[PDB]
Amino acid sequence: SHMAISHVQLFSVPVSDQEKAKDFYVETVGFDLLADQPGVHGRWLQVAPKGADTSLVLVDWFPTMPPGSLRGLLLRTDDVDADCARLQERGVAVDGPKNTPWGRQAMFSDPDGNVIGLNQP
Template sequence: MTQKTRSATACSIHSSFLPHTDAEASLAFYRDVLGFEVRLDVGGGQMRWLTVGPAGQDTAIVLHPLFEGNGITPEENATLAALIAKGSYFGANLAADDLDATFAALVAAGADIVQEPIDQDYGLRDCAVRDPAGNLLRIQQSA
């Protein structure tokens, strides 16, 4: 059997970015409901950036504020905010060791449920929720 070797230029996923509209609500959701650890909490007020991730993994999600500037006009910012609120702009796919227990915790926390756990035609069992900003999160049962 041949072992795969990692190329000197191979990369791994370090972090992905999702916008937040309320840092405290996002922090409570990702930390207290999903069980992510807080790795960084910088800034303040509307300019607060949170880095969260699953314990024992190197990957992270950076929750960042929407802001104007750097070429983004107030009108574009309003469009982005509207897309985020309805869950059609950003999102992430997560996995849970116990999808039913995770789903029950989401329901108990009052999460915005989009889809209850179901067996998909493509072989996964998953559910879907929106985080406090509206970002769509699909959570599948770990293999």
């Protein structure tokens, strides 16, 4: 009848130095470390905002996704101004916050240059 898909489980973020990316997403951005799993196929590094249904895999093994190539990623936050102040204190350049029709937004990049947005609806 209808599909049994509930949500996006995860998607991939292309990085170079995975240790550097781990420290960034976990320590600086504040995500939980869900898994850090070396194996035959590479190091599976998985992170998410605490309690979030959809997680991020910090991957270096997809040739069609060069490190730092990701754009158009937006994180929902309940306090964009406080998050921007924290990021700035933690050594991250933040563009914003700014008001938009869809919420108050800010932009920053990770160590490889992937572009990450924040939005407080």
